[PDB]
């Protein structure tokens, strides 16, 4: 009945080479958890004008897994050590950072004894508290590195949760989901949370060439601490699925033209599309950063520290 779409492109210069970028919005401002290894640092940065400003270095005195959680007035970032997958400790040691602003944090080492994810693959990600009844949870989820036709336990994904802002992780959140594929490799499991609804974004491969296919599963409560997950098909011919977010209660999905991502397409509710055409560079690494139910950013890094920021406004009545 009424559709509004507005796009804007801006640039951010970074004076730090980040091997991995983790964007988040805190108090209506853009931040980045920059992993820099040349010499290792985990800088917290903030968009000020046309540049990234380094506020802190959480690696002052300790490559770890980063689980950042943005609450209304707080930022809880955990840096967890991970040893070789096949020589792991039974207890996980993390460093918990707490802040009411963006600059100053307090470091506290924590231990997650007999943690349930010893046999799971963990990846770094930014997330939100998931409200289950009257409790707010922070989720650390992992997936089996491989799924085989003869798997004993058929639930590849598992979550451990904290409802004390990240101090203890004694809550287990069962995730009911078995990949359609009989034998599959998993990568970069990241939970997507919007309006107290749980979802997962991940990649699936088969050790062929260097193929990784994005998969997205939407989950529904079965019990308070149990979810049933299932595949959400966003497949498009001659377009490779890249990122998923939600604006206006609908999915906003980005795709590349091919696996080399020369250009990207953004589809709003699979009805309307815009084309992102990147000097000469691609949109590899393109990521949505939701601002509100009508605004989001689409960020990918060109050159070294040139971040192309696509500000998207979308409304549908």
């Amino acid at each position, epitope marked *: 009945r009424h559709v509004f779409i507005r796009t804007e492109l801006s640039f951010i210069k970074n004076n730090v080479p980040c091997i991995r970028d983790m964007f988040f919005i805190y108090k209506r401002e853009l931040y980045n958890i920059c992993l820099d290894d040349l010499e290792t640092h985990i800088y917290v940065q903030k968009k000020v004008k046309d540049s990234w400003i380094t506020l802190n270095d959480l690696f002052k005195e300790t490559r770890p897994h980063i689980f950042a959680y943005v609450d209304v007035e707080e930022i809880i970032i955990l840096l967890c050590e991970d040893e070789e*997958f*096949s020589n792991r400790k039974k207890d996980m040691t993390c460093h918990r950072f707490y802040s009411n602003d963006g600059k100053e944090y307090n470091n506290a080492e924590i231990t997650i004894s007999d943690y349930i994810l010893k046999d799971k*693959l963990l990846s770094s990600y930014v997330s939100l508290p998931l409200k289950i009844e009257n409790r707010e949870y922070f989720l650390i989820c992992g997936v089996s*590195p*491989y799924k*085989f*036709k003869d798997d004993n336990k058929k639930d590849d994904i598992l979550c451990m949760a904290s409802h004390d802002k990240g101090e203890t992780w004694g809550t287990k959140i069962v995730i009911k989901y078995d990949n*359609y*594929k*009989l*034998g*599959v*490799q998993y990568f970069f499991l990241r939970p997507y949370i919007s309006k107290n609804d749980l979802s997962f974004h991940f990649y699936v491969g*088969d*050790n*062929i*060439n260097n*193929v990784k*296919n994005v998969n997205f599963i939407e989950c529904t409560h079965e019990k308070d601490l149990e979810f049933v997950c299932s595949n959400r098909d966003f*497949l498009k*011919d001659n377009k490779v699925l890249q990122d998923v977010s939600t604006l206006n209660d609908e999915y906003i999905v980005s795709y590349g033209n091919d696996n080399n991502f020369a250009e990207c397409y953004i589809f709003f509710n699979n009805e309307n599309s815009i084309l992102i055409k990147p000097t000469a560079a691609g949109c590899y690494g393109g990521t949505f950063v939701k601002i509100d139910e009508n605004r989001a950013l689409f960020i990918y890094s060109s050159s070294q520290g040139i971040y192309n920021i696509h500000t998207i406004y979308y409304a549908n009545y």
Partner: antibody
Amino acid sequence: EVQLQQSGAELVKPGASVKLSCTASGFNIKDTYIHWVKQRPEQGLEWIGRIDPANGNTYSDPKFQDKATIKADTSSNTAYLQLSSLTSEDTAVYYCARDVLYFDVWGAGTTVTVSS
Amino acid sequence: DIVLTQSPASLAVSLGQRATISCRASESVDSYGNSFMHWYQQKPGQPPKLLISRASNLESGIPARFSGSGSRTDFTLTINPVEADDVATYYCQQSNEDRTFGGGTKLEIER
């Protein structure tokens, strides 16, 4: 009962093209990856490539030319190997196999013979 | 690419003896606790049949006289004791990086 039935033996004049069929029974090709292996008489096994029938993604070995196009149709539960412009160096038994991170289900083979 | 070499090219053993076929990989074939090295048996005029998957996993229906061992780049198939219907060519194959097969090892029975 899991299975992979391959097409019947066929003559193929040099330079002409052929399309073999690999049809599943007991499983859906969509939930797996169908591979092709070439075996010349008195020779070993030579991996050709694979189709991921869920998305249509295909990969053939670089050394093995792009003279083999892997195709699939999930509604018929069939995968295809299209070998074009075949020479006598293409006279071999072509096997199709299902991959679950190892080849657990095999096809009986199609004898491809280039016939002058 | 991961290149597979089998030793020996052929084996001559008697019924009841132990036969060990080795497979050496140019790169490590291990990933997240799994060794992606599998063994097949091919009898003339028939397709290869999966015997062992993931280095040591004996496939359902395959006799316990077939066993596999191996760590990163070095793997072994053991047939013990060898029986008359074990005459075949044995191939090793990896699925860690693309798919590659070993040369083959012909098993002949001495009687």
